[PDB]
Structure formats: structure tokens, C-alpha cells
């Protein structure tokens, strides 16, 4: 199997910036018929891979003039003249000169933007979940930046360390922020053994934590 | 408009078989080599099989991982390719994409998730997420929808039959106790809610579930 190596793994850049992704093969990609079967793809969050550059340097139909492919032999590079927010996602190269066809491990393009604090919302269990005898406490931390954030749940001033599920979205294609969901799943017996439920976040945009809470009885 | 429509994905017990299909339209099918590629968080993107066109006798190739277990075939009369998979293992799990490779370009289908597990199909439990005290965050309001304990993926979530697009966040599903749980938020202009009705619609093909929950105000 020919090995494809992609560098870097992550590439943060600002709108307008130029970006360079490199891809190397363990063996020559020049086919005995004389073509070099090296292609570049972009996979946007949630979508399937889309071809950008075919055979080292041919810009595919409908691809912006700001993407160019270059290289030969075993070193190829993909250049993006001026990064736009919609270029966000993972770029892959592949070789199809040899069977098996193989892909690089991908390079994630991240867009650097101005810090933005989390818009926090806390949600207590709906009557319907309580009837099934379940109590899930949901907290949304929407549109922040950078990705690095920390959430903690406090039940009656104490720190809960069991029953929390966290999920992060990929970076947004439109405004380049991140969101995150944090769910505290308790049985209803568990949920009525306490009163204060607190969603607490730590983002470098504020020195003090962003706190959102609600009390069961206070409800 | 080209499209590669792949179908036949879903949940299947290890050791059992599965058959995927791909229908192509919008380009000259006989001028292309068809390939199935799969993607999984573990190994990332991996090529699995290929079937060439007429000029090359419909020759087929496979990766060592599936040789002997997978068979690929095509029918130029129906613009279709098929992937017959037998004795599936955990390592075969992933999103399978139908692809067509040609002289001037290449296209990829949308992908179909194949889940190889012994677990049984579990319908999701859908619950609305209304504010503790619905007023105004700024010029907006965040509402939600919890899709609890289902199996397997995927689950489709839309807001207002689809009419509400901007301001929607659907988080990746997370595996808890052998089950998936997922949420979706949507932010709407304050004057809009609770004035007009907002509802999440959830669809879980595997269990043939289709739920529509309206998001109502809740002081509690
Ligand atoms: O490059 C070609 O001549 C070609 C033309 C029509 C259909 C397939 C191919 C094609 C190949 C044809 C002959 C060959 O020996 C190797 C080929 O590799 C290809 C690799 C691709 O990614 C994409 C396409 C090919």
C-alpha cells in the first residue's frame, strides 16, 4: 500500500490569509501511462467529500480560482490564495495510480476569528420526560470562539461527576463559531434528591464564569 | 446535476450479509470506473472495491480486507453499481460512499451508514426543550429538542417541517449505555415566539419513527 502523508494536521488561518497543505507519497505517483493520479478533496462538516483538484493541478468544474494544485513525483501541495469562511473543513489527497487506492489522513482548516462568548441556555426536564421517570438536564453553549471551553455542573453547590454527556458541533461555515451541548442525565428519583442545578462555563472571554441555573421547587 | 444515490444501508448483525446499491444520473455512466469507499472514525477514508468500464472488461479489484467476502457488480443498462457484503464484522462499520471516477473528473454519493451490531433497534424518545422563563436573550430566543436513547444512527431532525434553517444547531449523537442521545437547538426572533408555532420533527428510519413535537411555553 502506498502511504500518503498529509501535513499539517490542523491549519488555523484568518479570512484573507493564504494556506498551504502538503501531501507526500511513499512511492512515485507517476503512472506508466504517464498520468499522475493525485487528487484533492474538501469534506465540509456534515457533507461528503467533494473533488477540488484532479490529477495534481486541474481545477474541477465549479471550483474557485483561488484553489491551486502543484507538485510531482511524490511531493504535492495544495494552495488556497485567500481563505473564505466556506473553505472550512477537512482536505484530503488520494493516489489512484496504485491499487489499493489510498488517502492522506486529512488536514483540518480552522478559521481564526475574534473571540465571542457563549450564549448559555439551561433547560430543566419537560413534564413528559419526568412521566417516563427520567430527568435530563440540558445546557446549550452556543456560538463561541475559540473552541476550547470548559463546562461543569453543580448540583446543590456540589460538583457532579457522573451522568454528563457533552457534544461539540464542528466550526460553523457561516460565522466560524462553535457550539456545545451538555446533558446531565439523572433518573427522576435522582433528580428529586436535589434543588439547585447549575451550568457553569469557563471561556477566556470572561474572567468570571458564566453561570446559568434553576431550582426545582423555584420552578 | 449529477447524483449518486446509494441505498441499502442500516443495522445488521455480525456474520450476516448486506447489499448496497447505487444509481447514477446526470453523466455518461459507461465512461466511468465505479468505486466504493468507506469512512470510519477509526481508519478514516478507505477504498474497498472497484469495477472498471467496458473498454477494460469490467475488471474488478478489492482491498485485502474484503477480498473473498465482498463482490462488486455493475449494470450499464441501469446506470447502477452494487456491493454485496457477506460475513460482516465490527471493522466493516462505517459510511459507504459510491463514487465514479473518470477522465476529467470524479463524483461522490452522499454516503449510507452501515452499523454492524448485535444490539436491537430502539425507537428514540423525543422531548421538547422550552425556557425556564421565556423572555428575550437579546433579540433572540433559544429553544430545543432532545432525542433520547435510540439505536442505531442516523436520526433526522428538522425544524418546522424544514422552514426554519438559519439559527439551528444539531449536535453530534453520543453513545450512552449502548444507546444514542442527541439534541438540537434553534434560535428565533423574540417577537416570533411564542407567537407562532415552532416544532421539531424527528425521523428515525430504522424503527420507522416520525415524531412532531411542538415547543410550548413552560413556567413549570
Ligand atoms: O485516466 C484515464 O485515461 C481514465 C479514463 C476513463 C476512465 C478511467 C481512467 C483511469 C485510468 C485508466 C487507465 C489506467 O491504467 C489507470 C487509470 O487510473 C485512473 C485513476 C483515476 O483516479 C481516475 C481515472 C483513471
Contact B47 A134 (CB under 8 A): no
- Asked if the domains B1-118 and B119-216 are classified in one and the same CATH topology, the answer is yes
Cα A87 versus chain centre, distance: 13
Task: Please state the domain extents for chain B.
Answer: 1-118, 119-216
Q: How far is residue A40's CA from residue A68's CA, in Å, rounded to a whole number?
A: 10
Q: Contact, A42 vs A57, CB < 8 A? A: no
Atom of ligand 1 nearest to the CA of A35: 1
- Statement to judge: residues A51 and A153 lie in one domain: no
CATH superfamily of B1-118: Immunoglobulins (2.60.40.10)
Q: How far is residue A184's CA from residue B79's CA, in Å, rounded to a whole number?
A: 49
How many helices, marked H, and strands, marked E, lie in chain B? 0, 19
Ramachandran region of residue B161, left (φ > 0), alpha (ψ -120 to 50) or beta? left
Q: Yes or no: is domain B119-216 CATH 2.60.40.10?
A: yes
Question: Which residue's alpha carbon is at the smallest distance from atom 1 of ligand 1?
Answer: B103
- Statement to judge: residues A104 and A118 lie in one domain: no
- Statement to judge: residues A56 and A151 lie in one domain: no
Range of the domain at A149: 114-216
- Statement to judge: residues A5 and A104 lie in one domain: yes
CATH code of A118's domain: 2.60.40.10
> Domain boundary at A113, A133, A154, which?
A113
- Statement to judge: residues A92 and A177 lie in one domain: no
Regarding the beta carbon of B103 and ligand 1, being less than 6 Å apart is answered yes
CA of A169: which chain B residue's CA is closest?
B171
Method: X-ray
Ramachandran region of residue B190, left (φ > 0), alpha (ψ -120 to 50) or beta? alpha
Q: How far is residue A167's CA from residue A150's CA, in Å, rounded to a whole number?
A: 12
Number of folded domains that form chain A: 2
> Domain boundary at A113, A136, A160, which?
A113
Resolution, Å (one decimal) = 2.3
- Statement to judge: residues A71 and A174 lie in one domain: no
Q: Contact, A58 vs A4, CB < 8 A? A: no
Q: How far is residue A113's CA from residue A144's CA, in Å, rounded to a whole number?
A: 10
Q: Contact, A92 vs A86, CB < 8 A? A: no
E strand intervals along B54-118: 60-62, 70-75, 80-85, 94-101, 106-108, 112-116
Q: Contact, B61 vs A99, CB < 8 A? A: yes
Q: How far is residue A39's CA from residue A94's CA, in Å, rounded to a whole number?
A: 5
Question: Which residue's alpha carbon is at the smallest distance from atom 16 of ligand 1?
Answer: A97
Contact A185 B107 (CB under 8 A): no
Tallying the residues shown for chain A, one arrives at: 219
| Cβ contacts of B5 on chain A, cutoff 8 Å | none
Q: How far is residue B11's CA from residue A79's CA, in Å, rounded to a whole number?
A: 40
Amino acid at each position: 500500500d502506498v502511504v500518503m502523508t498529509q501535513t499539517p494536521l490542523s491549519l488555523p488561518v484568518s479570512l484573507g490569509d493564504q494556506a498551504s497543505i502538503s501531501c507526500r507519497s511513499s512511492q512515485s505517483l507517476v503512472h506508466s501511462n504517464g498520468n499522475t493520479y493525485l487528487h484533492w478533496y474538501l469534506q465540509k462538516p456534515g457533507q461528503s467529500p467533494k473533488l477540488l483538484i484532479y490529477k495534481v493541478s486541474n481545477r474541477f468544474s465549479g471550483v474557485p480560482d483561488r484553489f491551486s494544485g502543484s507538485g510531482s513525483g511524490t511531493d504535492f501541495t495544495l494552495k488556497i490564495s485567500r481563505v473564505e469562511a466556506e473553505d472550512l473543513g477537512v482536505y484530503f489527497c488520494s493516489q489512484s495510480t496504485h491499487v489499493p487506492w489510498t488517502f492522506g489522513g486529512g488536514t483540518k482548516l480552522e478559521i481564526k476569528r475574534a473571540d465571542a462568548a457563549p450564549t448559555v441556555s439551561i433547560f430543566p426536564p419537560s413534564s413528559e420526560q419526568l412521566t417516563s421517570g427520567g430527568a435530563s438536564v440540558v445546557c446549550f453553549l452556543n456560538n463561541f470562539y475559540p473552541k476550547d471551553i470548559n463546562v461543569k455542573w453543580k448540583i446543590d453547590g456540589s460538583e457532579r461527576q457522573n451522568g454528563v454527556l457533552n457534544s461539540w458541533t464542528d466550526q460553523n461555515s457561516k460565522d466560524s463559531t462553535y457550539s456545545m451541548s451538555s446533558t446531565l442525565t439523572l433518573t427522576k428519583d435522582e433528580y428529586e434528591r436535589h434543588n439547585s442545578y447549575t451550568c457553569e462555563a469557563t471561556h477566556k472571554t470572561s474572567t468570571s464564569p458564566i453561570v446559568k441555573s434553576f431550582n426545582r421547587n423555584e420552578c | 446535476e449529477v447524483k449518486l444515490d446509494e441505498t441499502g444501508g442500516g443495522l445488521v448483525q455480525p456474520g450476516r450479509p448486506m447489499k448496497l446499491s447505487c444509481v447514477a444520473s446526470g453523466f455518461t455512466f459507461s465512461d466511468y470506473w465505479m468505486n466504493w469507499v468507506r469512512q470510519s472514525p477509526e481508519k478514516g477514508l478507505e477504498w474497498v472495491a472497484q469495477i472498471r468500464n467496458k473498454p477494460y472488461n469490467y475488471e474488478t479489484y478489492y482491498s485485502d480486507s474484503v477480498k473473498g467476502r465482498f463482490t462488486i457488480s455493475r449494470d450499464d443498462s441501469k446506470s447502477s453499481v452494487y456491493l454485496q457484503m457477506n460475513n460482516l464484522r465490527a471493522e466493516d462499520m462505517g459510511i459507504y460512499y459510491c463514487t465514479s471516477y473518470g477522465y476529467h473528473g470524479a463524483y461522490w454519493g452522499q454516503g449510507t451508514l452501515v452499523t454492524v451490531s448485535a444490539a436491537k433497534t430502539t425507537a428514540p424518545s423525543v422531548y421538547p426543550l422550552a425556557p425556564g422563563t421565556a423572555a428575550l436573550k437579546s433579540s433572540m430566543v433559544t429553544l430545543g429538542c432532545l432525542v433520547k436513547g435510540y439505536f442505531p444512527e442516523p436520526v433526522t431532525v428538522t425544524w418546522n417541517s424544514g422552514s426554519l434553517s438559519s439559527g439551528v444547531h444539531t449536535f453530534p449523537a453520543v453513545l450512552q449505555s449502548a444507546l444514542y442521545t442527541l439534541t438540537s437547538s434553534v434560535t428565533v426572533p423574540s417577537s416570533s415566539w411564542p407567537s407562532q408555532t415552532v416544532t421539531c420533527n424527528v425521523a428515525h428510519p430504522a424503527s420507522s419513527t416520525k415524531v412532531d413535537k411542538k415547543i410550548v411555553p413552560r413556567n413549570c
